[PDB]
Amino acid sequence: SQFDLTPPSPAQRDALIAGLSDEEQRVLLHHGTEAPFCGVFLDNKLDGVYTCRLCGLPLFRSNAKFDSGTGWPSFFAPYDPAHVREIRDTSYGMVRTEIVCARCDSHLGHVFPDGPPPTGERHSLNSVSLAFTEDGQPLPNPLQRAGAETQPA
Ligand SMILES: CNC(=O)[C@H](CC[S@@](C)=O)NC(C)=O
Ligand SMILES: [Zn+2]
């Protein structure tokens, strides 16, 4: 990865958390799920990068976005394999794989093996877990880190 994946320290973490909605906290920090069909990014024409709403880490490119019919924004591949981490989720007596932001450990959604080609993979996202940066615009980079994060998306 061209990005510094070092977790923010408790101070940087709380600084960013403080800027977060009630609802954003519910999803990102407490494993919550958006009401399906309601998220701002469910339909989004634009070319660019979907970043972690907490720490700004690029998570998904628009060129990997597709319509799954589930009511959540969906991607067949992450920005970079190392940017999205998989965690076992046994909640609701189901067996699922939660996806978290590899840097800040925030909740994003789940990944499923029922996606389309090329990958056969479906990353199912909460729109509220994401911020969007259009192609060529500067990334939010709230942790002010070097490398690709100072570059336009
Ligand atoms: C089987 N599908 C599920 O569990 C989906 C995955 C959505 S992502 C945004 O967490 N969620 C439900 C049923 O709440
Ligand atoms: Zn993050």
Residue 35's CATH number = 2.170.150.20
* 4 part of a folded domain: no
* 2 part of a folded domain: no
Strands 107-112 and 58-61: unpaired
- What's the CA gap between 73 and 40, in Å, rounded? 9
Return the H-helix or E-strand segment holding 87: strand 84-89
Q: Is the dihedral of CA 43, 48, 53, 57 positive or negative?
A: positive
* 109 part of a folded domain: yes
Note down the domain range covering 68: 9-153
Residue 97: CB within 6 Å of ligand 1? no
Residue 99: CB within 6 Å of ligand 1? no
* 1 part of a folded domain: no
* 19 part of a folded domain: yes
* 64 part of a folded domain: yes
Residue 108 Cα to ligand 2 midpoint, Å, equals 9
Residue 129: CB within 6 Å of ligand 1? no
> Based on the structure, what is the number of domains in the chain?
1
* 3 part of a folded domain: no
Cβ-Cβ contacts under 8 Å for 72 (sequence gap 6 or more)? 34, 36, 39, 42, 109, 124, 125, 126, 127
Question: What is the amino acid identity at position 80?
Answer: D
Cβ atoms of 104 and 57 within 8 Å: the answer is yes
Other CB atoms within a 10 A radius of the CB of residue 63 amount to 10
* 40 part of a folded domain: yes
